[PDB]
Amino acid sequence: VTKVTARNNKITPVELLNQKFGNKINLGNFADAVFTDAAFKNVAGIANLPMKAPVMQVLMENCIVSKYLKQFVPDRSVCFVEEGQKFYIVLEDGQKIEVPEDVNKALKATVSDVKHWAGYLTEDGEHVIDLLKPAPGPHFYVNLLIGNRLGFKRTLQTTPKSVVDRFGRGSFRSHAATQVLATRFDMRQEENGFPANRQFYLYEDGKQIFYSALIDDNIVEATCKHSCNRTVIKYKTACNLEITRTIFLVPHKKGFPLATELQRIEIKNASDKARNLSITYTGMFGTGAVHAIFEDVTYTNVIMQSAALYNDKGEFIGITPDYYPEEFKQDTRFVTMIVRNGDEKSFPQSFCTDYNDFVGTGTLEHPAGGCNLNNKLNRKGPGFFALGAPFTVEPGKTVIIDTFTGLSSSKDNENYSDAVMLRELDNLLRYFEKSESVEETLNEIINFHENYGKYFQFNTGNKLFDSGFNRNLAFQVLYQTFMSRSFGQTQKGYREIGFREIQDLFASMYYFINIGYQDFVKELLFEWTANVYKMGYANHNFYWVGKQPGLYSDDSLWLLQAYYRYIIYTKDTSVLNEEVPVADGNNEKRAVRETLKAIIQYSACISVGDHGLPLLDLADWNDCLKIDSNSIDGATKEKLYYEQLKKTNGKYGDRFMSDYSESVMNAFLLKLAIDHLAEIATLDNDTQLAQQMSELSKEVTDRIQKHAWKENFFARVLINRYKDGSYTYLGAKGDKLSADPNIDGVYFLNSFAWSVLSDVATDEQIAIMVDVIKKHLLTPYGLRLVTPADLNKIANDTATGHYFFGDRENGAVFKHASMMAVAALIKAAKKVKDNELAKEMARIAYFMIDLVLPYKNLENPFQVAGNPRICTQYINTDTGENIGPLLSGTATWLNLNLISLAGIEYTRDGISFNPILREEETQLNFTLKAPKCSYKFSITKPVGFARMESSEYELFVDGQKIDNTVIPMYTDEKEHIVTLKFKH
Amino acid sequence: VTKVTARNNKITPVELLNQKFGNKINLGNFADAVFTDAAFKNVAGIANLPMKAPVMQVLMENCIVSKYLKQFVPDRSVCFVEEGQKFYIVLEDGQKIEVPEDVNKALKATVSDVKHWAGYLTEDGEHVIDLLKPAPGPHFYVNLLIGNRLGFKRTLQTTPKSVVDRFGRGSFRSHAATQVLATRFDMRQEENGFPANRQFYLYEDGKQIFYSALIDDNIVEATCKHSCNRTVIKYKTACNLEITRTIFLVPHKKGFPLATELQRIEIKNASDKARNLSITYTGMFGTGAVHAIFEDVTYTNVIMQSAALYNDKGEFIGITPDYYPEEFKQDTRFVTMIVRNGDEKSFPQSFCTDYNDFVGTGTLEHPAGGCNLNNKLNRKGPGFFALGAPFTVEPGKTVIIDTFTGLSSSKDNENYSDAVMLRELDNLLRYFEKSESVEETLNEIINFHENYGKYFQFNTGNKLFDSGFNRNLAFQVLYQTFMSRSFGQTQKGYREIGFREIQDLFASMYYFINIGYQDFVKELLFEWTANVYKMGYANHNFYWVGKQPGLYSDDSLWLLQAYYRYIIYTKDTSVLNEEVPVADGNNEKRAVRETLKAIIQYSACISVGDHGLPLLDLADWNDCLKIDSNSIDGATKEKLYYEQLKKTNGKYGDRFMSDYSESVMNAFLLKLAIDHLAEIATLDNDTQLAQQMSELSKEVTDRIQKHAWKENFFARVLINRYKDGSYTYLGAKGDKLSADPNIDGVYFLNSFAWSVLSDVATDEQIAIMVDVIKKHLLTPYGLRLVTPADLNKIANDTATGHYFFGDRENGAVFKHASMMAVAALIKAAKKVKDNELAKEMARIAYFMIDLVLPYKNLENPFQVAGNPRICTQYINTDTGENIGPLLSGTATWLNLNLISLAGIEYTRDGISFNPILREEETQLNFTLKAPKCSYKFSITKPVGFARMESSEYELFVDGQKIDNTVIPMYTDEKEHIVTLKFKHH
Ligand SMILES: OC[C@H]1O[C@@H](O[C@H]2[C@H](O)[C@@H](O)[C@H](O[C@H]3[C@H](O)[C@@H](O)[C@H](O[C@H]4[C@H](O)[C@@H](O)[C@H](O[C@H]5[C@H](O)[C@@H](O)[C@H](O)O[C@@H]5CO)O[C@@H]4CO)O[C@@H]3CO)O[C@@H]2CO)[C@H](O)[C@@H](O)[C@@H]1O
Ligand SMILES: [Cl-]
Ligand SMILES: [Cl-]
């Protein structure tokens, strides 16, 4: 027998359709087709579509169209064409047949409004989704909900999180990986939680009439609206019932449970007769023993039981899972339902806690015993629950069912027990007793996200871009600040906060400082500083305590940048005098200034190679550069360094002698950190520290220029363990490590990016690297992270690849690295003397940005996939599809790059205004919010590239023409108008 | 807010029903009831049931009965009675109302044949299951299928395994934990695999008319038959279609793939018109990366793609998943379908590889695009597949569809690639060309399991018991021998071939030797010996490499028992000279005799406490007895021991100094192992080794008697970490660790069991422990593992800190320990001088055995649950329900105990015949198979307890009266008749 793989099957159905019907009929710009047999010999398709979409699959789903095609296409290729508001079928020989009336009507109904199959964005950036249409990708219809723990202890650790899809499915997690609602670990990416989560059934006269997760013939229409931190789903039934589901997380208040999710279900009777209905709201509680799911499911089943909750009057209100082991009793989950028939409150009358009894002989969509629950408390088994209550809806009236699903944990209370959970649940119910109290709360949430994003507001003509930046991007930045990369649709494992993820604070801090939360930023900075050891290395990960000390060499170097930004924006040098505990433990504390000095010393003097550049250790920012197999972490290096100092009678601060490889990206980060520390010391009136840092920066720049430049590019890694000269460097021409014969040597994008960002490369070097990038690193789908390389020559311990071409580490475009490169390009374009080079760099930057903006994913949704409101991780270079977890460094650097392109940069003297606009753009207006004032920026230019470095410009501030390009930070609590005019 | 747990809700619906309607009506022996509201105030029920059953749930499922009840359920309790073949409803005030005609008819239909709701057992032990009835438990409708790799390299590691429920759902596994069909790791125990596995859809004229996993109005009846190593399911449709599914694992032949599962679907048209139907067979392959399902599913999705398979004629035949990484390219999966329309053969015409495209806007039960497949090869994603083919069925004719789902691995071929898979698949397809061949294969399987079990055959009057022992129990023992506790209905991961699971070979070996597979027994023994390190500790689990070295102390001590059994039965001492690689790695190889000596030394001299007993090492056989919190494994102990020897100027074999706790069960196991090794050395003409082992056994017995006996029982654990004397021992009177104020101390069943089994306890001690067991450890549901304890005062993370009382190790009836105790009771009853004590012990043993036999689970199926053909793990003492995985040592020790009760014990001089029969039994006939002969045993006795120790008996062999009670192992290739007759006083 023979095998034919998916990628080896070169001929696609669309290509075969074009071959067969290319000259006979006009196929238009887009067409769809499908193979009619496993032999891939005949095709069936429809032509002249507005955009690429799986129309053929939907057509085959229809019974009438399938039956009509059955008589035509078991072995004969056919095509569908539209002429004169009628549908014809064209055969391969040339006959055109007018289809009968029913199939013509079905085709007209299906083809209508193809352009909105994936949905559309409103003027506020909200995504409107039809529930009957296919999904472009697993992450396309996903929304992320967040809590609000501001003003409370351990904000990062204890913030609740949730993921909700278009049907309301998903999951809900408390601190760390604690699950309130069950998370499903299955083979598909679409299944994130248990199917019964946040779903309910509506019965009438003992007969099921509605299921929230099923669209039967009884539903005329059903739409979902994804917004910022809330989800709204609307159903309309054929029996004149309007159902509205609103899902959101409750912001934390004093005495509330640690995590709480609220779902409000409004049922309106549009008919003229009273309806006696019943509602059954189902769900499944998450387990406390996550590892036992793989190890022993029976262990998870037998260690817990079900319990009922009764209010002060002895009325049943909800179900909780009760655990026997003492360790699993530190978190207590609950679910509660309240029915409001206007101003009258009622509670569920029946419950079920057994999945088998509930489903019976039917399925989850049509439970056999879903109407009459047995009211039996299960002695074991998973925390499945179903609460049932009857009600009556008068003609034209509405009934509101509020469901609270939550968890109370010991991480927020002392002497924790179930009594604490009961008290907190009582407080929550008492707070939400009134019907309006829920609605107001929702408004509060909206107002928060309508204010947090007011730091930077765009006012361009394109409403989609303005909504995407002002609302969606700011929310994503806040979400990544609060959660880093610990949750998502496909990010279901347990993850701790990485040190490098402090990059998320680079963009979000300016928002927080502008809503009166500067102390929160200070607390985050101190929390990150507490994970730095005395020597200078830092813990790689930390959630409650740090771990992996000094595993990666580039971690601590990031911290400096963050501090710089803060001190630049607020002029608050007092943070330098704060005493923070060191990561070594015991009870020792150190000043922040001394910690920064130690961080600089650990990479500038100690832990350096033969060339004086920082050591690679296990790996730098890039986790694939595992060149050194015998690498050591911070603790082992410190012990060996102390032994060496004792043996050789050396002095502290001398080089740690070894033959490990050197990292040049770490050198660029070190140079940037040294410059930032010099600037901070200058701002702190510490002349000697500033002068020392300036001399150290000059020396490091000289070392980098002498040992890293290789006449064509900046080398990535310097190798010292080969004394015969077989291999000395990696990441430049002539390194003899390229896996592609057509490429002279390996090239790394980060080398150029951080050579420009650290202000090390000169103009000639910048031009040379730009030419090299255009030649090799530029692809039709973006910028590659690195050209193909063969690291087995130097590191034989490296294994083979794990991905097909175009996936992740096999040629994909990682949008985080591409965004850093775009930031470098924007920075270079503002200062290079050559105007043509600046124009080319700006063009490349805008081209790369246009491939990352989420709102542009709706132009060709069924080819690029992704998400129209949330940035994805990488782009598959073989197909162009946006793939990856919804949480990554893409959002932060995209926000920073857009702000920089607007021309806003913060320096010691204030705001260095220097915009770079698109060639076609002729007007750019935006509003900037400052702690003590505000600015309204307007920029006007003719068509074509323009910048103040070369073009002629007039600048006015408050109606007064000025020559300096630095705008001072006013403190008069007024709005200042800034106007820029470019003259041809 | 107030919280009320399930266990704190003392009142039950049946109790409330009895309270409300106890005197007004006759509730009979049984009744069913259900609360009508969450307040637990009123009840709705039905009386006079033949047995406990969820009748009320079925009634509320019915629309008519629910509608009739709805008028007065929330407010007042109601009961259903049947008088004069007509149903009446009784209220709490005494009113009796005749139900309407439709309600009466529905009630009559529902309450008919309640006795067979859980099914019944045929004459051959096969289980017949109705697919429209509720399941008593998650393990009640489960069957296990095993392959056959005998006569091929690395049999133990390469035998395929499968789990099939009543609907055919489950997962199919291969060598080690390699998944062929996807296994589902979810919250529920009932979901073992992906829901689409082994299921198919039948369409007619573009409309779905049949789904194999769904029972709807179109299905008149649907039954499943669970048998030995195959499953048969039958559906009958309202449109006169008969569908038969036969599922079994293909025995391995030369050139075949490593694992292959065959499902045959026969569709017969009972009408008088030809029908044009279409079949869509769906499934989902397992992933090579079993991990990263819990880390990142995207990685699992993007490292693989789909591929189509074409025969030599260029016709599509099936789908295979193709992986990029070299790590996952060592195993290649495939699925293929063949349609036999009498003599004509056809292949599937369409396929789908995307779950979203297949399901579409519908569900898995009613896929939107299940009839018209897009024929698109998915570039990524999980290996979902659906093969579709049309066919025409003539009136009265049958159409067969054969589906082969398999995996080919590099563990059986060299220079492996996908070409090897293609060649093996071609060979497999060539073998199964004729339609009859498949049937023949099935017969072969049956014949194997009809012969493997002929080693010991019962011939009693009770047909159910004979079918359960001769057929079901032997198959379960074989399966557990090949699989330990690795793969089952709920055993799905983290567990490999366990070292102590060598206990299974205690029972199955006699079968293998009797089918000419003694070399396979030797291979198994060497495979287990290969996981023993030089010092003596052993790997806890192993598939191809070991893991958890020396984590548990009780391991490596059952190897001595296994070797003793094999050598005694076969008189083959040559296995002592075999060179087996050690678990330390490198290339060192040691003789088996030296390995046994090292095992004895590691527990007799090294790794002993202050009293000279073996250390606990965080757990003995009892996995939840984690007394020591600062425990260490074998490697750390070895390093520390070598450092201590170097620093203190010691010599190898000295005690490893520490203050860890001591295990007395390990001491009993060590004493038994030393006795077995002494006997083996005596049989091997190794005089000085035998004398040394005898002296060591005497010394160990003296130590146990001096330090473990506590004047009321045998202590379980000796504690040495408390120098103030607050706690010194656990498992006897006066240990100050009892959680029950009415019980002086904690008591462990294993202490008595292995004191009797190891021949350490005396007759007076046996009587004292029997009295203690009857006072405390005897429960209506059997012998509980341990009395209530308060171990949290000395150590957390114990059994008492994990489970509710009455679950697993926390005082439940752990049937493995119960069977070991029954074995001890049987052994004691054959030799104690006191006849009354022996009678009581035999009565207790038979009482405990009656609670373990699977076939008795059908007497009260909806209360005891369990499985009518496979032994479960434990019994909950609060409810009596049989819970736990289908894999346990319960089956092995039940087989051993039932053989021992017949009197078959193998000694060095032959068979030590000494039967112990039931008091009410008066006749016992069975047949025994020997390597060079066979025996037919017949035993006759009057009613009442009788044994050769006290009762008068006559024994005849081949019609010759003899006095010696040891039957020699003849070698004349004939059948010998043995007759025993007991005479009353
Ligand atoms: O002698 C017994 C007999 O039967 C079998 O042995 C069984 C035994 O019968 C079972 O009782 C035992 O049950 C264990 C579960 O299998 C295992 O999954 C569970 O693991 C727990 C662990 O005990 C607990 O400490 C752990 O807590 C961690 C949390 O998960 C984390 O969140 C937290 O951060 O860290 C803590 C660690 O402190 O949870 C896991 C579950 O996730 O432990 C049960 C009791 O030990 O299983 C035995 C088999 O393994 C056996 O087949 C026979 O051979 C044997 O003779
Ligand atoms: Cl995600
Ligand atoms: Cl890099």
Ligand SMILES: [Cl-]
């Ligand atoms: Cl025990």
Ligand SMILES: [Cl-]
């Ligand atoms: Cl099982």
Ligand SMILES: [Cl-]
């Ligand atoms: Cl067990």
